[PDB]
Amino acid sequence: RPTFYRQELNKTIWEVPERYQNLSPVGSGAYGSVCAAFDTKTGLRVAVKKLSRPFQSIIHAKRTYRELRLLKHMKHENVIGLLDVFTPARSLEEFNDVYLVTHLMGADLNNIVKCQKLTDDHVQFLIYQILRGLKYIHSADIIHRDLKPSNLAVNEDCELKILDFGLATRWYRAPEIMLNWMHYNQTVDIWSVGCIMAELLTGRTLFPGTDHIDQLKLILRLVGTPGAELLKKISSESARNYIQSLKMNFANVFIGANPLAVDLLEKMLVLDSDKRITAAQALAHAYFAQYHDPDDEPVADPYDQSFESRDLLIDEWKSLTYDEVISFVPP
Numbered sequence: 001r002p003t004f005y006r007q008e009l010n011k012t013i014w015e016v017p018e019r020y021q022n023l024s025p026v027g028s029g030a031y032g033s034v035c036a037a038f039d040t041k042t043g044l045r046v047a048v049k050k051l052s053r054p055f056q057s058i059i060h061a062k063r064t065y066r067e068l069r070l071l072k073h074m075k076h077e078n079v080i081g082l083l084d085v086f087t088p089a090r091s092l093e094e095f096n097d098v099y100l101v102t103h104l105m106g107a108d109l110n111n112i113v114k115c116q117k118l119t120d121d122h123v124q125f126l127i128y129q130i131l132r133g134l135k136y137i138h139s140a141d142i143i144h145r146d147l148k149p150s151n152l153a154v155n156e157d158c159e160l161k162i163l164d165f166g167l168a169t170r171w172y173r174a175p176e177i178m179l180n181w182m183h184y185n186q187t188v189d190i191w192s193v194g195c196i197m198a199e200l201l202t203g204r205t206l207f208p209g210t211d212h213i214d215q216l217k218l219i220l221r222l223v224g225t226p227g228a229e230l231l232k233k234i235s236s237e238s239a240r241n242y243i244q245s246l247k248m249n250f251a252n253v254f255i256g257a258n259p260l261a262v263d264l265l266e267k268m269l270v271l272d273s274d275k276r277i278t279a280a281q282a283l284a285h286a287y288f289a290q291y292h293d294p295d296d297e298p299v300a301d302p303y304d305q306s307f308e309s310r311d312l313l314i315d316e317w318k319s320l321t322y323d324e325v326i327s328f329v330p331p
């Protein structure tokens with residue numbers, strides 16, 4: 001057991017192991033807060049997320065467990081991984097705080113893009129990594145749902161990790177997510193990738209919607225009204241009518257772009273989630289020829305997500321989370 005020290009951080013007492021130094025707040029919200037730090041034991045910069053009131057309610061408790069489980073499962077160099085999880089608590093009884101430790105890459109995608117056009121080679125490398133990450137995430141039957149530049153952590157070498165920093169926001173969201181559609185394809189994340197990629201290429205947000213409906217109209221304007229195939233999957237006449245108050249050959253936005261990039265964007269930014277390219281297919285797309293290695297695009301061990309369908313008591317989510325904390329083995 002490490003010795004803990006306390007400090008005040010993001011308006012609470014953070015009790016962390018001494019190996020973790022130079023804790024500096026980088027994000028805060030209702031679900032918790034995150035500090036950049038330096039792990040003097042591994043010599044790595046790390047982000048320490050302290051969960052906020054993790055066992056306050058069933059929802060907090062199951063969220064806490066969800067994230068812990070997910071992070072413990074992710075073992076891919078393009079996906080945020082759990083370097084450490086700790087609690088100051090010495091027993092289940094006193095267990096009330098969970099801290100999660102991940103690599104801190106240093107910047108998110110916005111920081112390195114800073115509203116600039118990136119080179120095609122650079123976009124290749126970045127999107128390749130995202131797709132590699134996503135292939136892994138998706139292979140575990142997990143859908144990110146909120147892929148966006150701020151959830152993409154990159155170091156100086158532009159090595160990239162996908163994470164979920166939730167504690168502009170709407171611009172990378174797959175249209176069906178915004179429409180509370182509920183039967184999500186993993187290609188919700190592909191939509192996001194297309195939005196990210198487009199932005200990396202052009203330096204401009206693909207769909208800078210002012211609000212929900214504006215976002216939707218911007219998407220319809222670019223990719224066009226639903227085709228007959230897609231229309232058949234929308235039950236509501238009235239909704240189809242409403243949509244009709246609104247393709248557009250991917251040329252104009254992506255002028256001067258590598259035609260391969262455009263071809264891929266076209267396969268990503270398809271309204272019909274059933275028809276969007278998958279992460280695995282995208283990885284094999286010629287656009288990534290420089291980086292694609294079919295034998296180095298790992299898939300995840302199958303991920304036990306049964307808990308997602310469970311309505312359990314706080315005590316059980318807490319005890320389940322506690323088990324995961326105790327049984328945690330660093331990389």
Ligand SMILES: Cc1ccc(-n2nc(C(C)(C)C)cc2NC(=O)Nc2cccc(Nc3ccc4c(c3)CCCCC4=O)c2)cc1
Nearest residue numbers: 047049063067080102104105106107108153162163164165
């Ligand atoms: C409820 C719930 C359930 C699941 C998840 N969830 N799902 C995933 C996927 C596996 C991607 C789907 C991943 C998480 N969770 C997760 O990423 N947690 C976490 C933990 C510690 C720190 C951080 N934050 C950062 C880390 C590094 C950096 C930055 C923030 C910001 C910029 C500085 C550079 C940098 O490098 C985020 C989230 C919430």
Ligand SMILES: CCCCCCCCO[C@@H]1O[C@H](CO)[C@@H](O)[C@H](O)[C@H]1O
Nearest residue numbers: 175176183184185233271272273274
């Ligand atoms: C902008 C207004 C039109 C947006 C419609 C987007 C349709 C999304 O695609 C749809 O995703 C569903 C949920 O995964 C799938 O069940 C459907 O089969 C698929 O067509």
Ligand SMILES: CCCCCCCCO[C@@H]1O[C@H](CO)[C@@H](O)[C@H](O)[C@H]1O
Nearest residue numbers: 179180181216233234235239242243
């Ligand atoms: C703003 C323009 C958007 C019009 C609303 C699109 C309607 C999508 O609505 C979705 O359609 C599916 C029916 O096939 C249902 O399974 C979903 O429950 C419903 O949310």
